[PDB]
Every structure is written in C-alpha cells, then in structure tokens.
Amino acid sequence: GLRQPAPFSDEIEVDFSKPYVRVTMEEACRGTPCERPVRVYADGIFDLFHSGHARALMQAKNLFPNTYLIVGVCSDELTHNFKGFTVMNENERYDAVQHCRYVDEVVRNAPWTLTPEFLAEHRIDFVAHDDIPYSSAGSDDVYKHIKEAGMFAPTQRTEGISTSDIITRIVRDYDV
Amino acid sequence: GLRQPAPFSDEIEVDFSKPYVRVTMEEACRGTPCERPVRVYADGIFDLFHSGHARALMQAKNLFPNTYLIVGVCSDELTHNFKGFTVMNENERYDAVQHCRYVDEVVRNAPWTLTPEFLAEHRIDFVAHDDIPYSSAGSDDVYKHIKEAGMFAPTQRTEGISTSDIITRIVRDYDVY
Ligand SMILES: C[N+](C)(C)CCOP(=O)([O-])OP(=O)(O)OC[C@H]1O[C@@H](n2ccc(N)nc2=O)[C@H](O)[C@@H]1O
Numbered sequence: 585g586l587r588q589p590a591p592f593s594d595e596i597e598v599d600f601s602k603p604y605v606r607v608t609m610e611e612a613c614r615g616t617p618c619e620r621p622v623r624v625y626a627d628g629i630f631d632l633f634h635s636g637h638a639r640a641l642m643q644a645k646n647l648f649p650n651t652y653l654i655v656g657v658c659s660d661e662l663t664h665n666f667k668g669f670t671v672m673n674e675n676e677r678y679d680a681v682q683h684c685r686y687v688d689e690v691v692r693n694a695p696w697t698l699t700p701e702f703l704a705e706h707r708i709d710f711v712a713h714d715d716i717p718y719s720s721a722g723s724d725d726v727y728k729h730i731k732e733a734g735m736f737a738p739t740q741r742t743e744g745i746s747t748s749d750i751i752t753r754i755v756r757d758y759d760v
Numbered sequence: 761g762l763r764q765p766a767p768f769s770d771e772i773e774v775d776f777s778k779p780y781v782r783v784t785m786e787e788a789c790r791g792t793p794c795e796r797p798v799r800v801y802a803d804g805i806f807d808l809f810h811s812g813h814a815r816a817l818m819q820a821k822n823l824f825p826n827t828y829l830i831v832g833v834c835s836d837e838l839t840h841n842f843k844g845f846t847v848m849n850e851n852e853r854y855d856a857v858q859h860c861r862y863v864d865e866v867v868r869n870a871p872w873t874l875t876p877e878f879l880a881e882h883r884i885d886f887v888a889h890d891d892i893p894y895s896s897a898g899s900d901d902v903y904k905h906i907k908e909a910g911m912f913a914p915t916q917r918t919e920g921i922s923t924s925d926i927i928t929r930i931v932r933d934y935d936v937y
C-alpha cells in the first residue's frame with residue numbers, strides 16, 4: 585500500500601525548467617497525463633487532526649482523476665497571531681498530516697493568505713477548502729483572490745466533528 | 761498515492777479455498793511473492809488517534825518487505841468493560857484508522873484476546889503491538905499465547921504523545937475549573 589510518511593516539500597525535487605502553466609478545470613476533469621498530475625493545495629491548522637480533516641483531504645485528492653495533493657500547515661506563530669490557541673504544536677501537526685492516506689506532500693510553515701510567489705513556487709493548479717469565506721481580518725475572505733482567479737475548488741465540511749467539539753467533550757468528560 | 765479509505769474487512773472478497781498456512785519470520789523477511797503479502801495484524805483502541813498510533817502502524821506495515829496491514833479496533837462496550845472511557849465513539853475511531861496512510865484493512869469490534877478462530881478467519885501471520893505485557897486481567901498478558909506461538913512482532917512506542925497526555929493538555933487549556 586503505502587509504507588512511508590508523505591514527504592515535506594523540501595524532500596522532493598521539482599523541475600523549475602518547466603514553467604508555471606496551470607491546467608484549466610476542463611482539462612483537469614478530463615484527466616491529465618501520468619507525468620502531469622493536477623496539483624491541488626489544501627491548507628489548514630489541522631489541530632487534533634481528526635476525520636473532518638481527513639475527509640476534506642480525501643475530497644481534495646479526488647477532485648480530478650490524476651491529482652497530487654499538497655497540504656500546507658500553518659506554524660504556531662501565525663496561528664496564534666491570527667486565529668488563536670493550538671493544542672498540538674506545529675511539529676506535531678506537521679507530523680499528523682504526514683500520516684494521512686490522501687497526502688502526497690506537506691508544506692510546513694504555510695502562509696495565511698496565498699501569494700503569487702507561493703502558488704508559482706509550488707506549481708499549484710487549484711486550492712481546496714470549504715466555501716465559507718475565511719475572514720481573518722483586514723480581510724473578509726482570505727481566499728477571495730483565489731476564487732476570483734478561477735483556482736478555488738470547494739470541499740464540504742464533515743458535520744458533527746471538529747477540534748472545538750472534541751475539546752468540548754473532553755472538558756465535559758473531565759467535569760463529570 | 762491513495763484516494764479511498766482503507767476498506768472494512770467485510771468489504772473484501774477472501775478466498776478460503778486457500779488453507780490457513782502461516783509464513784515463518786525467515787520467509788517473511790526474505791520477501792513473499794507479490795500475491796502472498798505477509799498479513800500483519802495490529803490491534804488498539806485508537807482513541808484520539810494521534811501520531812504515536814500512526815507510527816505504530818507505520819512500523820507494523822514495515823516489518824517485512826511485502827506486508828498487508830490489518831488493523832483491529834475494539835468496540836466501545838469491550839473498551840469500557842476492560843480498559844476505561846473513550847472520548848471518540850467506536851464509529852469515529854473506526855473511521856479515523858481508515859484514513860491512516862499505512863492501513864490496508866480494518867476489522868471492527870476487534871476482540872480483547874485473540875482466539876485461534878479469529879487468527880484463522882483473517883489469515884493472520886503476525887501480531888504487532890508494543891512489547892509491554894498487556895494485563896487485562898485474569899491475565900498477566902493477553903498477548904502471552906501469541907508470543908509463545910512465535911507470531912508476535914513488537915513495535916516501539918512513540919515517546920511524548922498519548923491519548924492521556926492529549927486529554928491532559930486540553931483540560932489545562934480550556935477547562936473552566
Ligand atoms: C488558515 N488558513 C486560512 C491558511 C488555512 C485554513 O485554516 P482553517 O482554519 O480552515 O483550518 P482547519 O485546520 O480548521 O481546517 C482545514 C480543512 O479541514 C476542513 N474541515 C475541518 C473540520 C471539519 N469538520 N470538516 C472539514 O472539512 C476545513 O473545511 C478545511 O478545509
């Protein structure tokens with residue numbers, strides 16, 4: 585099956601000879617050549633990595649018939665600054681994502697807002713995340729530019745599980 | 761890489777016109793034919809499934825060059841009866857193990873002590889778990905017979921992470937009291 589964790593982006597050599605040329609939704613759905621998988625990026629904190637996360641990564645991996653899934657995971661410094669507390673530290677969250685079935689590669693220290701430099705450096709064809717506007721603010725939606733450029737592929741959240749729900753059962757369990 | 765969850769054991773067509781014949785450690789380490797991967801079984805609760813669990817599965821999957829890893833996950837009733845409380849219910853625990861990278865198959869309602877019939881029905885060659893005697897009790901080690909029969913392949917625990925440690929950090933961080 586698989587035997588080794590998904591590598592960090594550092595451990596893979598990319599041909600910078602090939603220029604950054606994206607595939608359209610239409611070519612991506614028809615199935616790209618073996619050598620040229622559609623490169624999908626999904627980003628997250630992935631704190632208390634749970635099945636809600638893995639299902640999202642599963643959907644992003646299946647967006648197209650030949651897909652290579654890159655998962656960016658945000659550092660503690662960024663997450664603390666813009667969102668709040670992490671139970672698991674950055675190294676533990678990098679590690680958990682590496683053992684997910686659907687992942688092909690893990691970028692550490694992922695950015696909060698995606699930049700043209702980052703998308704070009706990782707040769708990203710599409711970005712996958714739920715469709716709810718992510719406002720971390722000074723912005724209404726950090727994904728707005730990605731949706732506007734036609735590169736956004738929405739996934740569905742798994743109802744009935746989340747980091748907050750899990751923490752909440754654990755504190756309820758502890759109180760009673 | 762992979763696209764679909766690891767299947768549950770009931771979703772897989774299994775040829776029984778094939779006798780239960782175990783491979784020895786020695787044949788296992790040399791590499792079995794492509795069509796006869798070494799079938800390794802690892803069992804657990806997998807509550808708040810974390811990297812220590814995943815690294816145990818990773819080791820079990822790497823024991824031999826051509827390995828098929830079957831992961832047994834115990835039901836809530838057994839766990840509550842013999843070990844203690846679960847944060848995740850059995851369906852959530854089953855599901856999480858299905859998304860682990862190293863798993864080929866998942867057996868639900870896994871037994872507490874392995875029986876000859878279970879080991880035969882799933883055609884298990886080796887059982888992987890850490891080497892600390894697991895006493896649930898009326899036994900000193902529920903893996904005792906597996907060890908004596910030569911089918912036990914010990915994995916190493918990942919230091920510094922556990923279901924308990926995680927619960928403990930969460931209580932410090934968010935509990936009102
Ligand atoms: C901070 N960003 C904007 C750079 C990345 C996104 O940050 P986030 O807060 O959505 O991260 P997260 O770790 O909460 O979720 C990562 C991904 O898993 C998904 N997810 C999470 C919980 C859940 N029950 N179902 C899900 O499908 C989210 O929709 C998201 O697509």
Ligand SMILES: C[N+](C)(C)CCOP(=O)([O-])OP(=O)(O)OC[C@H]1O[C@@H](n2ccc(N)nc2=O)[C@H](O)[C@@H]1O
Nearest residue numbers: 803804805806812813816872889890916917918921
């Ligand atoms: C109940 N049994 C005997 C049928 C199954 C064993 O039950 P358990 O309590 O060892 O289950 P568990 O979910 O705690 O552990 C599952 C597997 O993960 C391993 N594990 C757990 C935590 C950790 N930090 N490192 C690990 O390597 C355990 O050694 C075991 O091999």
